[PDB]
């Protein structure tokens, strides 16, 4: 009752969604029945680890004053005032409504202009957690969703891994190199990403390993492409293409 | 299910949609007013789609920015006004509905019953070489179609082309532009192949504008189906087309007489302010554009 | 027979087709044949779920 | 049977399709001016489609 | 799945019945037009 | 003398009534009937477990 | 110059406009219509 109870103590700390409350409860009851030696016990113990590990309400607090974003932006990138002005407007319209609001955005320009560095600078400006995630040339949609957990060797999709690592419920994801995403006939991830990047459907994101919906609604996705046009039209059309 | 007229979306979204997002941010209207004018301006600019989903995304983004101004920002009660909105969602992007207005010769508007909704894509044409390559020359003034042509568009194009060549010789012998000159023609993509021929009636009027060289009468959208001898045929899916024409500010339209049935199914508010011209033989159309 | 009993009082409430009733009866007979800790017992207990 | 007057150069033709049979029409037409040269000697090349 | 495969799970319908708790719900299959009709066992044929 | 197996095939446009005659024969001879679709199959194990 | 086809239509269009521009400007010259010409656009521009 040790793994179960450290899942329990964190349950006392992090408020899992009530559906996740129930699911972790039945899986917790399942953990004691199994042998430590049983093969399924390993995958389901690691599954419950993967499930409990996810922050559920852990909230790195943001600054919400525009001023502190002003300063911290000027400290680490000279000039390029246009993008600073635009991002300031984006967070101004995010705070204009009240709470943070999602929207997708994209940056594009010559390689090495400083894109990712300002990305991280915003992550420490806003105070949200950072995690870069390149997706150039992939076509294995399973990486974005793991595998069924009944497949040999299944592990949860990348997103769940970033939530386990960044440990906040609301990090700052930074998708990299959207332009070169492997967009093929062999199962186009780019169609699969639409469920991720939809401001509404992230709130119930699910992956093949652990079926239960996750709630990404506070996450701040970002995308970087060397040229914005190669990206398929349905995907390019959602996010703004800042230059 | 059909689409929705632009004005109609206001009466839907103001009741069954706006309150929902208002319940999503947890505010009440007393502190977070959104006038009708802000919504009509919105739909006028950022979303020209028969469905309401895109306007729902816009107003969502605006609302969540208002939530960000509440929960951490300064105001305890954001007060959206139409002049304010461009603050929240930035500057308007699109404005120039109906890009050309004088419609300089050889480009004409055309309705298309696209895969989702309907849109009044223009078709364009122009000369591509000098005409008097040989005063004695007897070579066909070959056309060259472009724009992700389907093969059916190739037969339609030659049909309409030959009909132009016959109408000129029957009408204005002194002109010889068509048989003595090459012409590039471009149909922008978007029409699904099955409806493809319905654009064809637009095509012939394009060329004719180049022929006499006068601009077509302003903002006169049309559609139909040509017979290679000037008889016209019914086209399908008219209601989406007509609402798209309403969205574009069109104030006249021309259809085959065989579709006088379906057009009367439309809601009466849709039919106010138009002046339709049912026709069968093509010659009619020639006298309702040029003279 | 804990899981079997909670699902069986369930069975008593929802009116299962009698065919499916007997089919889950033979399957439950197999579940009695199946081990308490086996990973296949987990697959077939979550099947019972 | 769409056409009824059958304007020249279109003829009916039966076809034992994969399911049933259907009376598909066959059609043809000019693709260039015919009198390209009163002396012209070029094979009137066909283009099947 | 067959339920003998590793990681096997019942088709989506079994889950909708598991969730909705009525025997006579209103299922809403979405976006039927673009269903993948391939050689790998066509679900669109399976839907019949 | 005894009953005998034999193979047979029917073919034609879909919906001509094929499967219905199958069953009519099944209640004609009085043998038990059993449909077995194999359209689109690839599982050799289905033929051999 | 490793042309994309879109440049081909643009090029012939511009060519025809040149052919018109001379005769509209200085008819006595006939250099364009009476001589072959190679023309080279270095690659590097993105197609759009
Ligand atoms: N305005 C700037 N101030 C400081 N460093 C810059 C600036 N612009 C670019 N850089 C540097 O250039 C590099 C570019 O990296 P980055 O934007 O992180 O990814 P990419 O290499 O794809 O642009 C970084 O090392 C960054 O420090
Ligand atoms: N001669 C017939 N007598 C009775 N029913 C027929 C006849 N021909 C066709 N049908 C009808 O055709 C339908 C489908 O026939 P069947 O061959 O059994 O399947 P399918 O035709 O789809 O392969 C049945 O519902 C059946 O009633």
PDB file of N, CA, C and O and ligand atoms in Angstrom, chain A residues 76-80 110-118 120 176, ligand 1:
ATOM      1  N   UNK A  76      16.807  40.839 -22.541  1.00  0.00           N
ATOM      2  CA  UNK A  76      17.482  39.676 -23.111  1.00  0.00           C
ATOM      3  C   UNK A  76      17.394  39.583 -24.626  1.00  0.00           C
ATOM      4  O   UNK A  76      17.778  38.550 -25.184  1.00  0.00           O
ATOM      5  N   UNK A  77      16.861  40.601 -25.313  1.00  0.00           N
ATOM      6  CA  UNK A  77      16.748  40.652 -26.780  1.00  0.00           C
ATOM      7  C   UNK A  77      16.711  42.123 -27.155  1.00  0.00           C
ATOM      8  O   UNK A  77      15.747  42.817 -26.830  1.00  0.00           O
ATOM      9  N   UNK A  78      17.751  42.593 -27.828  1.00  0.00           N
ATOM     10  CA  UNK A  78      17.750  43.979 -28.232  1.00  0.00           C
ATOM     11  C   UNK A  78      16.796  44.093 -29.400  1.00  0.00           C
ATOM     12  O   UNK A  78      16.629  43.156 -30.183  1.00  0.00           O
ATOM     13  N   UNK A  79      16.195  45.267 -29.520  1.00  0.00           N
ATOM     14  CA  UNK A  79      15.488  45.679 -30.708  1.00  0.00           C
ATOM     15  C   UNK A  79      14.320  44.772 -30.987  1.00  0.00           C
ATOM     16  O   UNK A  79      13.669  44.297 -30.048  1.00  0.00           O
ATOM     17  N   UNK A  80      14.172  44.392 -32.262  1.00  0.00           N
ATOM     18  CA  UNK A  80      13.071  43.569 -32.773  1.00  0.00           C
ATOM     19  C   UNK A  80      11.743  43.927 -32.092  1.00  0.00           C
ATOM     20  O   UNK A  80      10.936  43.082 -31.707  1.00  0.00           O
ATOM     21  N   UNK A 110      14.110  33.759 -40.934  1.00  0.00           N
ATOM     22  CA  UNK A 110      15.347  33.053 -41.234  1.00  0.00           C
ATOM     23  C   UNK A 110      15.823  32.267 -40.032  1.00  0.00           C
ATOM     24  O   UNK A 110      15.467  32.600 -38.889  1.00  0.00           O
ATOM     25  N   UNK A 111      16.463  31.119 -40.245  1.00  0.00           N
ATOM     26  CA  UNK A 111      16.854  30.306 -39.094  1.00  0.00           C
ATOM     27  C   UNK A 111      17.848  31.088 -38.253  1.00  0.00           C
ATOM     28  O   UNK A 111      18.639  31.870 -38.776  1.00  0.00           O
ATOM     29  N   UNK A 112      17.795  30.898 -36.943  1.00  0.00           N
ATOM     30  CA  UNK A 112      18.750  31.589 -36.107  1.00  0.00           C
ATOM     31  C   UNK A 112      18.467  33.050 -35.844  1.00  0.00           C
ATOM     32  O   UNK A 112      19.388  33.787 -35.492  1.00  0.00           O
ATOM     33  N   UNK A 113      17.240  33.518 -36.068  1.00  0.00           N
ATOM     34  CA  UNK A 113      16.890  34.899 -35.735  1.00  0.00           C
ATOM     35  C   UNK A 113      16.693  35.127 -34.245  1.00  0.00           C
ATOM     36  O   UNK A 113      16.721  36.282 -33.810  1.00  0.00           O
ATOM     37  N   UNK A 114      16.679  34.074 -33.428  1.00  0.00           N
ATOM     38  CA  UNK A 114      16.390  34.193 -32.007  1.00  0.00           C
ATOM     39  C   UNK A 114      15.035  33.720 -31.565  1.00  0.00           C
ATOM     40  O   UNK A 114      14.651  34.032 -30.436  1.00  0.00           O
ATOM     41  N   UNK A 115      14.255  33.107 -32.460  1.00  0.00           N
ATOM     42  CA  UNK A 115      12.903  32.637 -32.174  1.00  0.00           C
ATOM     43  C   UNK A 115      12.785  31.901 -30.844  1.00  0.00           C
ATOM     44  O   UNK A 115      12.060  32.360 -29.952  1.00  0.00           O
ATOM     45  N   UNK A 116      13.416  30.728 -30.721  1.00  0.00           N
ATOM     46  CA  UNK A 116      13.210  29.944 -29.507  1.00  0.00           C
ATOM     47  C   UNK A 116      13.665  30.707 -28.267  1.00  0.00           C
ATOM     48  O   UNK A 116      13.100  30.508 -27.181  1.00  0.00           O
ATOM     49  N   UNK A 117      14.724  31.518 -28.384  1.00  0.00           N
ATOM     50  CA  UNK A 117      15.190  32.215 -27.194  1.00  0.00           C
ATOM     51  C   UNK A 117      14.132  33.179 -26.693  1.00  0.00           C
ATOM     52  O   UNK A 117      13.909  33.270 -25.479  1.00  0.00           O
ATOM     53  N   UNK A 118      13.388  33.831 -27.606  1.00  0.00           N
ATOM     54  CA  UNK A 118      12.387  34.753 -27.080  1.00  0.00           C
ATOM     55  C   UNK A 118      11.240  33.919 -26.554  1.00  0.00           C
ATOM     56  O   UNK A 118      10.468  34.398 -25.720  1.00  0.00           O
ATOM     57  N   UNK A 120      11.325  31.099 -24.840  1.00  0.00           N
ATOM     58  CA  UNK A 120      11.646  30.819 -23.453  1.00  0.00           C
ATOM     59  C   UNK A 120      11.608  32.092 -22.639  1.00  0.00           C
ATOM     60  O   UNK A 120      11.269  32.054 -21.445  1.00  0.00           O
ATOM     61  N   UNK A 176       8.157  23.099 -32.343  1.00  0.00           N
ATOM     62  CA  UNK A 176       9.256  23.614 -33.159  1.00  0.00           C
ATOM     63  C   UNK A 176       9.118  23.057 -34.576  1.00  0.00           C
ATOM     64  O   UNK A 176       8.717  21.905 -34.761  1.00  0.00           O
TER      65      UNK A 176
HETATM   66  N1  LIG H   1      18.168  39.728 -30.174  1.00  0.00           N
HETATM   67  C1  LIG H   1      18.931  38.734 -29.684  1.00  0.00           C
HETATM   68  N2  LIG H   1      19.546  38.853 -28.510  1.00  0.00           N
HETATM   69  C2  LIG H   1      20.309  37.871 -28.004  1.00  0.00           C
HETATM   70  N3  LIG H   1      20.528  36.700 -28.607  1.00  0.00           N
HETATM   71  C3  LIG H   1      19.987  36.462 -29.794  1.00  0.00           C
HETATM   72  C4  LIG H   1      19.130  37.475 -30.397  1.00  0.00           C
HETATM   73  N4  LIG H   1      18.711  36.973 -31.544  1.00  0.00           N
HETATM   74  C5  LIG H   1      19.254  35.746 -31.657  1.00  0.00           C
HETATM   75  N5  LIG H   1      19.978  35.424 -30.588  1.00  0.00           N
HETATM   76  C6  LIG H   1      20.736  34.179 -30.414  1.00  0.00           C
HETATM   77  O1  LIG H   1      20.660  33.377 -31.591  1.00  0.00           O
HETATM   78  C7  LIG H   1      20.369  32.003 -31.331  1.00  0.00           C
HETATM   79  C8  LIG H   1      19.142  31.558 -32.144  1.00  0.00           C
HETATM   80  O2  LIG H   1      18.388  30.602 -31.422  1.00  0.00           O
HETATM   81  P1  LIG H   1      16.809  30.333 -31.237  1.00  0.00           P
HETATM   82  O3  LIG H   1      15.848  31.445 -31.600  1.00  0.00           O
HETATM   83  O4  LIG H   1      16.851  29.877 -29.810  1.00  0.00           O
HETATM   84  O5  LIG H   1      16.517  29.104 -32.212  1.00  0.00           O
HETATM   85  P2  LIG H   1      16.941  29.293 -33.732  1.00  0.00           P
HETATM   86  O6  LIG H   1      18.394  28.929 -33.673  1.00  0.00           O
HETATM   87  O7  LIG H   1      16.079  28.298 -34.461  1.00  0.00           O
HETATM   88  O8  LIG H   1      16.700  30.751 -34.001  1.00  0.00           O
HETATM   89  C9  LIG H   1      20.237  31.940 -29.810  1.00  0.00           C
HETATM   90  O9  LIG H   1      21.471  31.440 -29.314  1.00  0.00           O
HETATM   91  C10 LIG H   1      20.069  33.370 -29.358  1.00  0.00           C
HETATM   92  O10 LIG H   1      20.691  33.653 -28.116  1.00  0.00           O
END
